[model samples]
Target: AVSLDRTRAVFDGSEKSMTLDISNDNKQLPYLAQAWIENENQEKIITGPVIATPPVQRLEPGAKSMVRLSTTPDISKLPQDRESLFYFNLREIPPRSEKANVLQIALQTKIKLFYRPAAIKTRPNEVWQDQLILNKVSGGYRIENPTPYYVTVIGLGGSEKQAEEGEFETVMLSPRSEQTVKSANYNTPYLSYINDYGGRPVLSFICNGSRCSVK
Candidate 1:
């Protein structure tokens, strides 16, 4: 088994690269760690703007290693006004068993990777998630993202409890985009967004007429 240190990766345009730590859990046998990058469509990229260093590595038993994700010069071709999304995948391939009847299983981990261009500025004290707007529409509510960052809404409900436990819609709104979500009996809706550190921070809304603001 293998585990990643973080759930997601964020690569800033101003930075040269980002590193992720991976650890092997087996105590007796060594495993091969294979890393790769994929587009937002979940298609494996042969050669893209971003690539992983040491694409294949051998990990000693119970040993840890780091995978560095670096951007190529072609990264400048990406949109500077909005974030480009990608997927980082890591798979652990176990050694072949000595016994003929044994079986081997490879475990893979996939997480969202965001490439934030240099044009968009982010402050530690200010978060774009707070700027999200919700408007009551026919049969549903229209959610608007006014900032230049990708906002992933993973959970939605009328209250904190319901937002955390109930089945609701999940969406990843592109920069400066708007989408409509079906109303699930939400009066004062609670929306949750995935932050840079992969934390799900819930946003409670205060509504008046058709407009809604974060509470």
Candidate 2:
């Protein structure tokens, strides 16, 4: 099996490249690691703006390695106002067995990769999710993303325990977009957003009439 150091990767446009650490866990045999990039739809890109270096490498048992993702000039053609989504795929090919009539399976790991353009002015101390505006609506609530970055709300509940359990539905709010959730109860809605490091940080709200502010 192959393991990745990070659950997700963010490639800031200001940087030249990003790197992901990979490790082979099989202690008995060496394995081949193949890395590639795919679109959000899981379609393989023949010549995408981002390319993985050392696309194929052999890793000895219990070995650790790194794969570098570099962006080409074509990356400039991508949207600069918002973030673009991609997937980084790493497949581990096990060594063939010397015995006859043996079946081998290759394991693959895919993770989200966000390409954040330089145009998004993200402050170090700023909590981007705080820009999300929530308004009590007729049936449910209208959630708005007024920021330039993509916000993914993975959990929502009336209490902190419920939200931490992630028992509610998930929603992805694009840059400057709005989405509505139809919920019967709206008492102190607790929300969780996926941070850059793949951590789900919870935020509770204080509602007054129609407006709700993060607490």
Candidate 3:
């Protein structure tokens, strides 16, 4: 069995690079690894630094190999003050056996990559804290997104599953946009956004511009 130390990565501009650890679990004596970035639609995201060298190796039964990924600091081209979504794909190549009629299938893994700009003004949790304003509306609840950052909600205040008890339909709110859902579902006074880094805004969890109510 192969394992990854972390499921996702955060590029907040504070650090110029990120790392991932992979283990082989002694399943195969030796294996090769490769990685790349891609968008939701499966389009390759042309960036830099990935796929640990030897490019073809690891896992000495109980050891972990660090995969380093360096990213381009093209702030102007990437999203500004918002989270840009992408995927980090890791492929494990097994050696071919001399035995005839045997098939060698490559094992693959994928995880999320969130590109956050340094100019986002606030840390992740603070942005999540300040931006989501939940209010009761006629049809349901109208949640507002007044920030430049994207909000991925698991629940409004509770769960995002039931029509009357949770978010019901959409789970995402774009920058400066609003979506209306069943008011009964979002009865709680607080809203929970992803503060987790598989991804979230890291700098501010609750803040306006630079000033924030740290949690």
- Which number leads on lDDT? 1
lDDT against true structure, model 2: 0.84
The window of 10 residues in a row where model 2 has the poorest summed lDDT is: 160-169
In order of listing, the candidates' clash counts read 0, 0, 14
Candidate 2 matches the true fold with a TM-score of 0.89
**Pairs with backbone N, CA or C atoms under 3 Å apart (clashes), candidate 1:** none
Alpha-carbon runs more than 4 Å astray in model 2: 98-103, 137-139
- lDDT (Cα, 0-100) at 81 in candidate 1: 89
Q: Is candidate 1 or candidate 2 better by lDDT?
A: 1
- Candidate 2 backbone overlaps, count: 0
**Backbone collision tally, model 1:** 0
lDDT of 1 by residue, 1-215 (tens): 66887778888888888788998988987889999999989898858799887898999889998899998899999999889989999999988878888667789999988888977756656677999999989987899999888888887788988777777678889889999987665889898888988788899999988899897
**lDDT by residue (tens digit), candidate 3, 1-215:** 45766656666655666676677765446666666677755566554422223344655655567666566535447666676666777777666788999878878888766666677746544535464665556765666777776666554433223322443343767668888766443333444455445432222223333222323
TM-score of each: 0.92, 0.89, 0.64
lDDT of each: 0.86, 0.84, 0.57
Q: Rank the candidates by TM-score, best first.
A: 1, 2, 3
* Model 1 / residue 43 / CA error / Å: 1.4
